Amino acid sequence: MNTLQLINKNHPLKKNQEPPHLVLAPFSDHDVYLQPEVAKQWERLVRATGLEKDIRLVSGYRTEKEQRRLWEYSLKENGLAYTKQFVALPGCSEHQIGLAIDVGLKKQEDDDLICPHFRDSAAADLFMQQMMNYGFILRYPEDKQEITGISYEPWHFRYVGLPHSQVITAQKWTLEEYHDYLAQTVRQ
Amino acid sequence: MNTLQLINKNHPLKKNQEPPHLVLAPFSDHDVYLQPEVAKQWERLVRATGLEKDIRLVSGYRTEKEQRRLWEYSLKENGLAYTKQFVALPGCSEHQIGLAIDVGLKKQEDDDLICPHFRDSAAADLFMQQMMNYGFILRYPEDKQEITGISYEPWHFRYVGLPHSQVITAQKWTLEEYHDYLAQTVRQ
Numbered sequence A, B: 001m002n003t004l005q006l007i008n009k010n011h012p013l014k015k016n017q018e019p020p021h022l023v024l025a026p027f028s029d030h031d032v033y034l035q036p037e038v039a040k041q042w043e044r045l046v047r048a049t050g051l052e053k054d055i056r057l058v059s060g061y062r063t064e065k066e067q068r069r070l071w072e073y074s075l076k077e078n079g080l081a082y083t084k085q086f087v088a089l090p091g092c093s094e095h096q097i098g099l100a101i102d103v104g105l106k107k108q109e110d111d112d113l114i115c116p117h118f119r120d121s122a123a124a125d126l127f128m129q130q131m132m133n134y135g136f137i138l139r140y141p142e143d144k145q146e147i148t149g150i151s152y153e154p155w156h157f158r159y160v161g162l163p164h165s166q167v168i169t170a171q172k173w174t175l176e177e178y179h180d181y182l183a184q185t186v187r188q
């Protein structure tokens, strides 16, 4: 189980890839499932930031079939442009390996399917200060769209574990750039 | 597509069972998947009742592994007796075939994933007046626990389609009793 696995349009999942072990993750108002270490660190993060009343887990594990239904729904409802921007192709979603969390605010009207609100908020600010100390990175940062192939998603966090999350966040890297960095270092 | 399939402790899913067709379902704050006709009738029901801003889809299709992890979670958090009251055994949940919905109120903060709040509100009252006209039944009514093997769940609805849901609801039947009725009637 590689917590650093790069999954995107250029690196899709293999169909022989073992489905992740899963557990039900806490701090949601519905059933969300995550790889066990991810759930454990998510829980540690929420408790340590004391954000129990302020944030919630919106989305976790999705099967490929589910990712395809999500994709097809957004394509139909929101059009190809929006969908390519904000939804990963089936086979290319981190949600399919149980290492991705979508996080939202608990006091939200509007709250949308594809783009849960995790912006303009003291809680989100605190979450962004401590996330990396529990193994999470902001997967799709602003102005990295050409590197990640995905538009800015303040709600989507990827578990990579320590110290990777701290290294990545401090350098304001994407996971793509992190792999580039590691490959360049073994190359030198 | 057997919309009347009886799934419970005494009638588990087989792995003769091909997985359900699935679509992303509307009127939720996260990704919920349902069999297509279920999602369609759910959407019609919410629009007809004008409850788009009042209720939400909490849970839909759940894989067998997910049901197992949900059950294991409840065991840890709530103990065995509570879990058996409210959570179907893995392999015995209607959620695994995509014909069940858990419904909650859209305004509820820190809602319970196991037992979503769905009583003492005008929204729930109106939903209970119209659900059966769109193919849904209250799966686990309050005075039927010896028949269903499950405690009263005001939030849990099962799609059986028309006219079945109207027949079942007018008789204050369970799906168990409905099956016994159809069986008994055939022998006439």
Ligand SMILES: C[C@@H](CP(=O)(O)[C@@H](C)N)C(=O)O
Residues within 6 Å of the ligand: A059, A070, A086, A087, A088, A089, A092, A093, A094, A095, A102, A113, A114, A115, A116, A150, A153, A155, A156
């Ligand atoms: C790129 C992400 C989009 P998301 O899952 O955060 C959004 C659909 N909720 C993915 O599809 O894996």
Ligand SMILES: C[C@H](N)P(=O)(O)C[C@H](C)C(=O)O
Residues within 6 Å of the ligand: B059, B086, B087, B088, B089, B092, B093, B094, B095, B100, B102, B113, B114, B115, B150, B153, B155, B156
């Ligand atoms: C977990 C909730 N109590 P449910 O999903 O409404 C219970 C139902 C019997 C099932 O586990 O399918």
Ligand SMILES: [Cl-]
Residues within 6 Å of the ligand: B020, B021, B022, B023
């Ligand atoms: Cl399908």
Ligand SMILES: [Zn+2]
Residues within 6 Å of the ligand: A059, A095, A100, A101, A102, A155, A156, A157
């Ligand atoms: Zn996501």
Ligand SMILES: [Zn+2]
Residues within 6 Å of the ligand: B059, B095, B100, B101, B102, B155, B156, B157
């Ligand atoms: Zn249910």
